[PDB]
Amino acid sequence: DLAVQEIFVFTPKGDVITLPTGSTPVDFAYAVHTEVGHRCIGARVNGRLVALERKLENGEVVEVFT
């Protein structure tokens, strides 16, 4: 019940995905591509490369690849 600070992200396609504070690429990947999420290898934020442990940014373009 507590908490509230929610996060929002955008995909290269234009779609928008809502995620809770501290949302990692793994969650986003699994949400979008079941394969990527299942065995995520890399991710890119706003065209830039990032690690799987890198926290997802709100409004930024999140990318993930198995």
Record keyword descriptors for this entry.
32% strand, monomer, GTP diphosphokinase, alpha+beta, 2 helices, 66 residues, three-stranded antiparallel beta sheet, Ubiquitin-like (UB roll), two-stranded antiparallel ribbon, 20% helix
Percentage of β-strand residues:
25-35%
Number of helices: 2
Assigned CATH superfamily:
Beta-grasp domain
What structural class should be given to the helix and strand makeup? Answer: alpha+beta
For the biggest sheet, the summary is: 3 strands, antiparallel
Secondary-structure arrangement, i.e. CATH architecture:
Roll
Distance N to C terminus: 34 Å
CATH topology: Ubiquitin-like (UB roll)
* Strand order, largest beta sheet: 4-3-5
Please tally the β strands and state the result. Answer: 5
Overall shape: it is globular
Any idea how many domains?
A: 1
Describe the structure.
By secondary structure, the chain is an alpha+beta fold. The chain has a single domain (6-65), classed as Beta-grasp domain (Ubiquitin-like (UB roll), Roll). Helices cover 20% and strands 32% of the residues. It is built from 2 helices and 5 strands. A 3-stranded antiparallel beta sheet has the order 4-3-5, covered by helices on one side. A two-stranded antiparallel ribbon has the order 1-2. A hairpin with a 2-residue loop joins strand 3 (42-45) and strand 4. The longest helix has 8 residues, at 25-32. The chain is globular and about 35 Å long. It is classed as transferase. The entry lists the keywords Mycobacterium tuberculosis, tRNA binding, stringent response, RNA binding protein. It forms a monomeric assembly. The entry is titled "Solution structure of TGS domain of the Mycobacterium tuberculosis Rel protein". The protein: GTP pyrophosphokinase.
